Structure 1
Amino acid sequence: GRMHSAGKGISSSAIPYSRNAPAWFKLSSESVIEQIVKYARKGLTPSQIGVLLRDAHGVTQARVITGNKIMRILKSNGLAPEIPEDLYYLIKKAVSVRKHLERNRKDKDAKFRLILIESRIHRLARYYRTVAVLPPNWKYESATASALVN
């Protein structure tokens, strides 16, 4: 593993075998969807929404409670972000690295990391353009990357 590293870490979530809501869960799926929409309106990405749901409420998985994934619920409710969340965060990190590199310009480690991050961005954007999540002409340009993350 570790596409851009030599690490072999296996840490991840081990989601349960049970595909149904837990017996102690007594909130409604409609209430969970309403809270999801409220969080999205407050400006939270699907991963943050799921984190807050699982921490502050009893919703273990919005898929096993509402029957749908969080990004799917957001898209059905008309709150889908312009670009996918992981790609957005990759471009945000690339913007941060490029800003630090403009300021420093001696950070060859940062130059190498920027190359890695932009390669990851380009691979993700190729996948999204293939599955038509992004327009076929969508392009990551460094000079307008910040303008596309805001």
Structure 2
Amino acid sequence: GRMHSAGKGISSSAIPYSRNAPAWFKLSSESVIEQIVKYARKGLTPSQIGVLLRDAHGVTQARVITGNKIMRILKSNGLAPEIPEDLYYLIKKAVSVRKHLERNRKDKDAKFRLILIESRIHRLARYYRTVAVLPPNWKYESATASALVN
């Protein structure tokens, strides 16, 4: 029930049971590999890849069609990105919020929400400590985000 409010939401996907094939789809596994790796340099994020893959071509999930899970694949190919993608939207949100707090120090709602958010991050950053996918020590630093992306 979402970890920050009074809210008990339910809504995901009801991956379907079949492990193998769609059958109705008859194109190749190699085929979508190529496609993702096509996409990536252009300017991707794995989250989006699937969406784009789903809405246009055969696919159903990368997952059936290959024995991997997008990322894995980009990582083999070296396109993983320096960041674990979900993070690179949170930090972003930081900058994008803090900035707004500073045009209008007379705003609380916003304030709180910022924190809240500093925290999403520390916890998620503690995990992508733990498991060898952030060089140890990483710590998040409020002010260092604006030449980390632009």
TM range (shorter): over 0.9
Matches within 5 A, 1:111-126: 111-126=111-126
1:22 offset after TM fit, Å? 0.1
Report the CA distance shift for 1:107/1:113 in structure 2 as closer, same or farther (over 3 A): same
Q: Deviations over 1:74-120 (max 9, x none)?
A: 11211011010011111011110011111222221111111011211
Secondary structure of the residue aligned to 1:142 is coil
User: Paired residue for 1:88?
Assistant: 88
1:21: Cα distance to partner? 1.8
Name the CA distance, whole Å, in 2 between partners of 1:12 and 1:149. 30
Kindly tell me: are residues 139 and 147 of structure 1, through their superposed partners in 2, closer, same or farther at Cα, counting changes over 3 Å?
Answer: farther
Q: Stretches of 4+ moved more than 4 A in 1?
A: none
* Deviation, structure 1 residue 61: 1.2
The alignment's TM-score, normalised by the length of structure 1, stands at 0.95
Aligned equivalents of 1:106, 1:142: Cα separation in 2: 20
Q: Do the aligned partners of 1:94 and 1:114 also contact (CA within 8 Å) in 2?
A: yes
* Equivalence map 1:1-150=2 (5 Å): 1-150=1-150
CA separation in 1, counterparts of 2:56 and 2:30? 17
CA root-mean-square deviation = 1.2
Q: Tell me, what secondary structure is at the counterpart of 2:92?
A: helix
What is the alpha-carbon distance in structure 2 between the residues aligned to residue 129 and residue 147 of structure 1? 23
Deviation per CA, 1:43-99, whole angstroms, max 9, x where unpaired? 110010000001111211102211111101111211011010011111011110011
Structure 1 residue 38: Cα displacement: 1.4
> Is the contact between residue 88 and residue 149 of structure 1 (CA under 8 Å) also seen in structure 2?
no
Superposition TM-score, scaled by structure 2 size: 0.95
Alpha-carbon offset, residue 5 of structure 1 = 1.4
Q: Is the 8 A contact 1:128 1:134 kept in 2?
A: yes
Q: Percent identity?
A: 100
| 5+ residue gaps, structure 1 | none
Q: Which runs of 5+ in 2 are unaligned?
A: none
* Structure 1 residue 149: Cα displacement: 3.8
